[PDB]
Write a protein that binds this ligand. Structure first.
Ligand code: MG
Ligand code: MG
Lengths: 254, 254
């Protein structure tokens, strides 16, 4: 009955999106529009300079060739899926999307692209690689919840599932995004001709990971549910910025 | 005296970043780490699957080959620039970065990557293609302001400059991000073999563009300054989401 646009950032060949597709197919109409390769770190990137080609597999799965997760959802909703989906579900990602990492997340971005549909979009990420079935079960519960009663406020739900058997999941926590210290590591590596190439290093250590953060919930064995929005305004900085400008005389003659 | 990491998303061959480099060089030490091509829509994407090669031009400008604006700033701060920069400036972009478009913006993303440095990073975008000198002048004023007195709160400043002679700029407004209606257009286009390719269409119409939004300030001929943060949490949705979960019985047996 429910029309689900299913995407991810790991690609069409990810167990995560496959497991979830099979699970969601049990009770809903599902359509897989996904990248052709691992587009981790793709964030909210989208293809503007080129048009997009859509490669279909035997099972019906639509890849978008060179496509970003945002491209996939954009095409899914406006072009490919008829009738238009009720919800976008993104995942299950192999790996967590927590804290300030969510801005870099293609999984999150796919969900953010579905923010205007009738149901809040779900980004679903597993804190590891083992228990997709656990994350599938959590995803299905939320969808079951959405069918029972619509979520009035909150247009995106960032969901992170501990890499545990479902029996060991302690429950669900409504959380806020934590944050890390700045990532400072670059990993240099020479090419055969001696030229120095650079790899982006690991993330910074956790900084803001308290009582109520997505980090802490997951570390404790709870599902973290964070409502997300696309408004990047640091609203609490408004007055400080205004007073600063006046104090330094920028934008005023006096 | 001031150490500036200068990046963009238009590329090394953009007049925008060139104009600003020459202008900033008048009073500060500037280093251009930028993409090799037009990476508009690159958002906060970053290269994880590959290491990165850095192409230097005669004038000193460092391109990062296949590099995203985030890659450029990441490498700039942690690897390339010694001593470490005091600030990241990103722009001047050819085109506005306003409203909910900022999540897709490589220009903004480059600035967000510099959020941990001693000075708030600046993303600078021109509402058109003509008056880079105007945007350069606004950028220099803000930097002049920062040298006079440090900005206590707000780690990123999204700056949008009307495409006007400086004399016609009305002043500066501290704004919040506006928003648009959902973008719904896809532009189909056949390839020589008859296959249908899809272009991402134009943005949706402005929805939230009032008294205090970045959209309205720019339309009125003011510089818009929006403090941005990387926290995507829709904080006001917290209680609604929690009550919803309990009501539908997800995460509770009862
Ligand atoms: Mg991934
Ligand atoms: Mg651009």
């Amino acid at each position: 009955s429910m029309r689900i646009l299913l995407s991810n950032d790991d690609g069409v060949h990810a167990p995560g999106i496959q497991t979830l597709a099979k699970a969601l197919r049990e009770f809903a109409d599902v359509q897989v529009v996904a990248p052709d390769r691992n587009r981790s770190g793709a964030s909210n990137s989208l293809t503007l300079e080129s048009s997009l080609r859509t490669f279909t597999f035997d099972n019906g799965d639509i890849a978008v060739q060179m496509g970003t997760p945002t491209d996939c959802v954009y095409l899914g909703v406006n072009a490919l899926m008829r009738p238009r989906p009720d919800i976008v579900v993104s995942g299950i990602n192999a790996g967590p999307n927590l804290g300030d990492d969510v801005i870099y997340s293609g999984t999150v971005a796919a969900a953010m692209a579905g923010r205007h549909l009738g149901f809040p979009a779900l980004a679903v990420s597993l804190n590891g690689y083992q228990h997709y079935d656990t994350a599938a079960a959590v995803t299905c519960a939320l969808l079951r919840g959405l069918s029972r009663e619509p979520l009035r406020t909150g247009r995106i739900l960032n969901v992170n599932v501990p890499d545990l058997p479902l029996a060991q999941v302690k429950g669900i926590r409504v959380t806020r995004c934590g944050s890390r210290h700045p990532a400072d590591k670059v990993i240099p590596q020479e090419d055969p001709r001696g030229n120095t190439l650079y790899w982006i290093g690991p993330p910074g250590d956790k900084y803001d990971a308290g009582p109520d953060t997505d980090f802490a919930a997951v570390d404790e064995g709870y599902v973290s549910v964070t409502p997300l929005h696309v408004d990047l305004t640091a609203h609490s900085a408004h007055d400080v910025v205004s007073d600063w400008l006046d104090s330094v005389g920028v934008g005023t003659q006096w």
